[PDB]
Amino acid sequence: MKRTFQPSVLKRNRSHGFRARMATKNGRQVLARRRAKGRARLTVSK
Amino acid sequence: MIREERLLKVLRAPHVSEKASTAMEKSNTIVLKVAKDATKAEIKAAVQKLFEVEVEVVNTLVVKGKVKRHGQRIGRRSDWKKAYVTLKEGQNLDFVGGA
Amino acid sequence: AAKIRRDDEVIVLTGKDKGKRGKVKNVLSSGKVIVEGINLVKKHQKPVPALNQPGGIVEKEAAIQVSNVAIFNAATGKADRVGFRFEDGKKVRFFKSNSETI
Amino acid sequence: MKKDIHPKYEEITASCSCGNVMKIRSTVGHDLNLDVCSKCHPFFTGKQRDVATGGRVDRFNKRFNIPGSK
RNA sequence: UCCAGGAAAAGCCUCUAAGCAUCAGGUAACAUCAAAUCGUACCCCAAACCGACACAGGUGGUCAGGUAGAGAAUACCAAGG
RNA sequence: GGUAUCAGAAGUGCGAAUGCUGACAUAAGUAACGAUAAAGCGGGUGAAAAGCCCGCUCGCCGGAAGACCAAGGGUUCCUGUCCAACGUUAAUCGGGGCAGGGUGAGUCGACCCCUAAGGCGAGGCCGAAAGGCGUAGUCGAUGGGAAACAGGUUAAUAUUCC
RNA sequence: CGAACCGACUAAUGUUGAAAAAUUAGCGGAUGACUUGUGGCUGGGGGUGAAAGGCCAAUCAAACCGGGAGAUAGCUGGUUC
RNA sequence: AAGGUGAUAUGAACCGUUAUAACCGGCGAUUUCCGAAUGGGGAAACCCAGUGUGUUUCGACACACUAUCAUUAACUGAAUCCAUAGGUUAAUGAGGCGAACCGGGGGAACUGAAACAUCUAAGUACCCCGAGGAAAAGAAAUCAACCGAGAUUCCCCCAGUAGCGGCGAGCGAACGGGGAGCAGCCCAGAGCCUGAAUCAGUGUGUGUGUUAGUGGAAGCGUCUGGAAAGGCGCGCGAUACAGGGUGACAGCCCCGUACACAAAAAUGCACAUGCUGUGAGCUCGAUGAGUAGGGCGGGACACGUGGUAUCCUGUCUGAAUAUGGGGGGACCAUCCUCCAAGGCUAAAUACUCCUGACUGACCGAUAGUGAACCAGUACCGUGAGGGAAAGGCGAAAAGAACCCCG
């Protein structure tokens, strides 16, 4: 049956992940702790 | 002219693909591994000053590479930009070097 | 570092052949000393899948450390650890502790 | 929050009861405005007590020669 | 016809303001130049997507042949698979 | 490469903690090989064919088990090749490996004008700081704005090429 | 009344499944408090709830992730020549 | 400086040997798109405009500028004469990252008390702001005890003392002593004199460090062995026998090594300088009011209101003003000591993202970093986030031509 996922790029920004991270103290914090702390190749947006 | 742009190197490399020689009716066209961003107009003019041929129209597109290759397992794409561009009839390859 | 340039006629040291002649060589800055007196008969397959499947079982190199009989003029070795002066502008190679530049 | 002329407050504290409450206390002072300047006329500062009484022994002018200068 | 009384903004048409004031603009006819840049392959009720699987599950829209039939049921068939 | 000796210092001695990691057993060559729409034969190729290519039968679906597109995927498309691993077997075959080739637009779509829900938000109002709210305004389709068809053709493109 | 579509009353099978809730035969609604695509808004003592403590990503009498953290464990186990 | 075109792989095509080929160090030139991202927008690396430009076969290409705040400048400018509010332009400047130490605003709970409210954990965790190379504090309204010491800071003592505390658990000083370090100064204002010491930013120089480097000693023989650095004989260097490397363990084979030299340029700190600003020095003055106290509520002082001094305060009051005012642990007298309501300040002290040299009765692939290896990778998750496995042929590729089964 409906397994909890259902992808949709557009629905992957302000609603979640993507570049929206650059709009909030914590949001932008995530990037630091993520990239810097333990260099991540990261990928977020595709 | 309004050569002011990048007419310097908008075009480059043929293709000698299967499409080659098979794509010649009323008008031989071309391929050229044209730069990723040369637009159509610039292409039309590129073959104007150089090649000294008469271009009717241009088309072009993109074609993407893709492949895994790495010290273990990564590898990636490559990217291009094809470009047919038509010429005419009354003017053949003339003095030149096909290849 | 090595200074030993091409055509530099040295002699074999350390072991194996030893006491052999050999000159020129093909050493390079941080590279390798072919010389002439270091090489056992080896082999090549037919790498080139082509008409000319060859081989190469004859001649080759035997690296070996730059630590070979220093150039040597009279007897053997004779370290070149000395520096000339006021000659050339680039270099000023000297020579064995016997005489002076050579 | 303001009481501009004087600092302000809004510092926290714990409001104990009979022995002890590990609760928190805070926001104080108040506000008001519309202060007539002998010069042209009133800009409404939101001072409070200890701020209002200050504009008295003092000025109205020097009491403002700072919220401008600095 | 009914009660539960059924987006918005732009394009579009039109009216004038400031301004223009033999000008520019407007309408029509045709002549010509321009229309850039990305996407386009293939899967798509599935072996290319969501389910760890070449998983009897899940997934929105479109098309809608013959005989029979109330019929997008159902049975046998076209094209096709 | 090691280290009598006497002395010195310990990540100092495993059989168990449903201990942690790895390797190998056992059951056992057992169950199972994924819809009960079953397939037969003659050729071809090949080391070998029940399964691949060709052919004739046979059966199954057909409001679909057909065709097209969106979402999502991201070369899976076509050609040549090769069969280790992957295919719940064999495999000469494949959505597998390695090569190449392959998606051509003024009219289709996105950009782009327009705005919905909602988001953001000069200045502004609030609020210990972070920050919340919001005026102008600016974004935001799932909605409104302009224009192409029918034949043909490629191994694979197509209201794009002729 | 009955297909699509939506839902789940019964029985069998499955229970190291085809499947971490389905398949088969029946079953209820099917112009409505209907059903569905796309996107948006509510955040954890908080949300949403035709109410069952139900749902909030196979997690819910207080989500997941990281931290205080080697919480505490008068209990169980284990403790090497 | 004789080589050289980074690596996994040569190879091709080449550049070089004298002195502009490499290669190393300094200063530059360039430096797409995104990202504070700054012309506007945007699902990050894409989309769209305005206004200027050059070459222009003179439509264009790209280029360049145009975010927002703050300070100042000038110009414009409402209701309302004025004046402001607002607007435009321009020059400066900020904005974001950043490991820890540091100042500050906000601030738990598990836990302990063998329960639990006071109390503890702990002002710790955490979150937020800010700044430096250190920050902070700092020249007595300090302490002492009738003797005197003399800013702050950090170290050892005093002491687990005094004291605080359901006087439970637990919290826990100081006077005073031994040291590291060691300096004090400005405005609260006029006059005389008058650019004088003192700092700050800057151009310069010298010392001495940082960024490339240069020279740098002295061994033959024979034995065993594939190979000698090893055995044995003799011989030499040593301000060098640290170490590494070389076909088994080398002072004398190579790199180094002690020692001794070295910098166009670029910068750290020092001293010195010039420029700009600052303002010395003498005299005579002035001497930090919504403040000190205090009533209520709290927080901080080792001190849980206690008899509780003292510090900061939310809230409400409110003085003397140097023959005056604070303090000396309730409070009063006496005596002593010190001037609060304004500010600046080196050092000793703290920390490690990073730099070079060096060390280790530290590990040696289940260890040691999660990672000795294309690891924060593969994977796993909507995501935040979690997070691997994985070293060794040989001295030399000499990595096995060729033949045979298939």
Side-chain angles (χ1 to χ4, degrees):
Chain A
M1 291 288 142
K2 200 101 140 297
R3 275 311 312 173
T4 176
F5 311 85
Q6 206 210 294
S8 60
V9 189
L10 201 169
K11 254 173 60 216
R12 217 222 99 171
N13 184 65
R14 209 275 176 171
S15 175
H16 169 73
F18 265 4
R19 77 111 159 193
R21 291 250 143 63
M22 290 291 158
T24 40
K25 323 113 273 166
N26 5 269
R28 214 179 180 293
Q29 240 308 73
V30 164
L31 287 302
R33 40 135 71 110
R34 189 175 178 59
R35 178 61 200 62
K37 303 197 169 308
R39 307 173 271 95
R41 248 50 85 175
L42 169 59
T43 186
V44 287
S45 330
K46 187 240 81 73
Chain B
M1 191 6 228
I2 295 255
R3 182 209 143 139
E4 205 159 50
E5 48 247 350
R6 73 166 348 242
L7 223 51
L8 11 165
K9 301 180 172 54
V10 262
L11 89 89
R12 63 192 293 153
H15 215 218
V16 66
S17 174
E18 178 89 291
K19 292 287 191 175
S21 265
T22 317
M24 271 73 248
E25 186 18 71
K26 80 100 168 53
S27 188
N28 308 183
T29 56
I30 225 93
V31 226
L32 275 54
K33 223 182 183 83
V34 173
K36 196 277 135 192
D37 52 350
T39 86
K40 285 175 138 192
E42 278 171 51
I43 284 303
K44 188 161 284 111
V47 216
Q48 133 60 25
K49 269 193 180 62
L50 301 313
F51 282 99
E52 355 160 83
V53 289
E54 261 178 296
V55 181
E56 270 296 330
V57 201
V58 194
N59 290 296
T60 89
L61 57 112
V62 292
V63 68
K64 281 302 157 70
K66 164 63 221 142
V67 74
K68 78 77 51 194
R69 208 319 293 179
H70 206 80
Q72 303 145 329
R73 179 150 255 293
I74 300 297
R76 228 166 48 250
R77 210 186 283 284
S78 319
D79 123 74
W80 282 326
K81 181 162 202 172
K82 203 173 162 168
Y84 293 78
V85 336
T86 65
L87 289 312
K88 195 189 164 288
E89 333 66 43
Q91 52 112 145
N92 286 35
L93 305 313
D94 275 54
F95 208 97
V96 75
Chain C
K3 317 103 52 273
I4 314 185
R5 186 166 135 158
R6 210 165 130 149
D7 194 81
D8 201 295
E9 198 242 15
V10 307
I11 294 305
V12 179
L13 243 175
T14 325
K16 195 78 121 200
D17 299 274
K18 273 181 292 185
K20 231 157 181 188
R21 299 196 63 66
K23 58 194 298 307
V24 195
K25 318 135 72 62
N26 185 68
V27 74
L28 298 130
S29 311
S30 289
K32 56 172 184 175
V33 258
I34 310 179
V35 194
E36 311 261 63
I38 343 175
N39 191 234
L40 191 286
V41 59
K42 290 115 176 62
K43 111 94 198 58
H44 277 172
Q45 337 198 58
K46 299 291 182 74
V48 205
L51 182 134
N52 331 302
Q53 323 260 35
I57 193 169
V58 191
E59 250 243 83
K60 190 49 189 160
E61 104 279 302
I64 229 297
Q65 309 282 163
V66 242
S67 307
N68 255 176
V69 175
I71 188 273
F72 120 87
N73 300 40
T76 63
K78 274 304 296 171
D80 339 312
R81 277 63 211 60
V82 189
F84 197 63
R85 69 303 173 162
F86 304 76
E87 194 193 61
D88 329 309
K90 36 138 203 199
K91 299 184 275 292
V92 70
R93 340 79 152 198
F94 197 86
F95 231 83
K96 43 194 286 180
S97 178
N98 153 272
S99 62
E100 346 189 79
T101 173
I102 305 163
Chain D
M1 183 206 198
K2 302 143 183 50
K3 82 145 75 165
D4 151 78
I5 294 76
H6 233 39
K8 43 120 191 217
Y9 190 56
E10 307 208 322
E11 286 194 47
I12 27 78
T13 142
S15 141
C16 288
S17 164
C18 242
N20 190 288
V21 195
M22 192 179 271
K23 68 167 280 202
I24 163 195
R25 171 89 114 305
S26 56
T27 296
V28 310
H30 3 61
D31 66 315
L32 73 321
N33 26 283
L34 229 58
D35 269 74
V36 179
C37 69
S38 50
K39 285 180 68 173
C40 11
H41 66 131
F43 177 75
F44 62 118
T45 47
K47 29 178 163 185
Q48 311 176 353
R49 195 260 142 68
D50 207 59
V51 205
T53 176
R56 332 179 82 151
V57 290
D58 231 293
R59 324 295 172 224
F60 271 160
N61 289 298
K62 294 177 183 179
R63 287 286 30 88
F64 183 44
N65 194 188
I66 335 178
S69 292
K70 277 115 273 300

